[PDB]
Design a protein around this ligand. Structure first.
Ligand SMILES: [Ar]
Ligand SMILES: [Ar]
Ligand SMILES: [Ar]
Ligand SMILES: [Cl-]
Ligand SMILES: [Cl-]
Length: 162
């Protein structure tokens, strides 16, 4: 298992514009297109993203390409964030994939706000971090996914995904 297969499991794959768990227009493997309620706006950002008139539908390859760019951007965002980088650098490989997943889902900014959990992670206090991480809107809104990521930080193994 790896970051890609993990996020492919948490996100699914949809080839037509859809709304995500928050009601926002998305496509592919969790590629958010826009926070705007306008379908046209969403279709416009899609065409710009792909480089053609897609009419709201893309192929599997195009979806995978967007996903690769998104995973890459997520990692780079972590490495550029002064609050996240040190945490991430202290982690083992499995736990780093858990940190990437969160950032992918909620943004760098979002993640940078779990101050207390970040410090527990940095300190390798797994169980405590896990309890703190669950005290969040993130966990109350998407609890099955949050539990998989949390267990991943807790144990350092992929069992939640097997
Ligand atoms: Ar992190
Ligand atoms: Ar994180
Ligand atoms: Ar975190
Ligand atoms: Cl893009
Ligand atoms: Cl969920």
């Amino acid at each position: 298992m790896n970051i890609f297969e993990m996020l492919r499991i948490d996100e699914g794959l949809r080839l037509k514009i859809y709304k995500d768990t928050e009601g926002y227009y998305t496509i592919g493997i969790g590629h958010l297109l826009t926070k705007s309620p306008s379908l046209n706006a969403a279709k416009s950002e899609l065409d710009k993203a792909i480089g053609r008139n897609t009419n709201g539908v893309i192929t599997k390859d195009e979806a995978e390409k967007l996903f690769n760019q998104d995973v890459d951007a997520a990692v780079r965002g972590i490495l550029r964030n002064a609050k996240l980088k040190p945490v991430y650098d202290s982690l083992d490989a499995v736990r780093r994939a858990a940190a990437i997943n969160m950032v992918f889902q909620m943004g760098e900014t979002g993640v940078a706000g779990f101050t207390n959990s970040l410090r527990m992670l940095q300190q390798k206090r797994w169980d405590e971090a896990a309890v703190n991480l669950a005290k969040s809107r993130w966990y109350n809104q998407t609890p099955n996914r949050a539990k998989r990521v949390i267990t991943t930080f807790r144990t350092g193994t992929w069992d939640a995904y097997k």
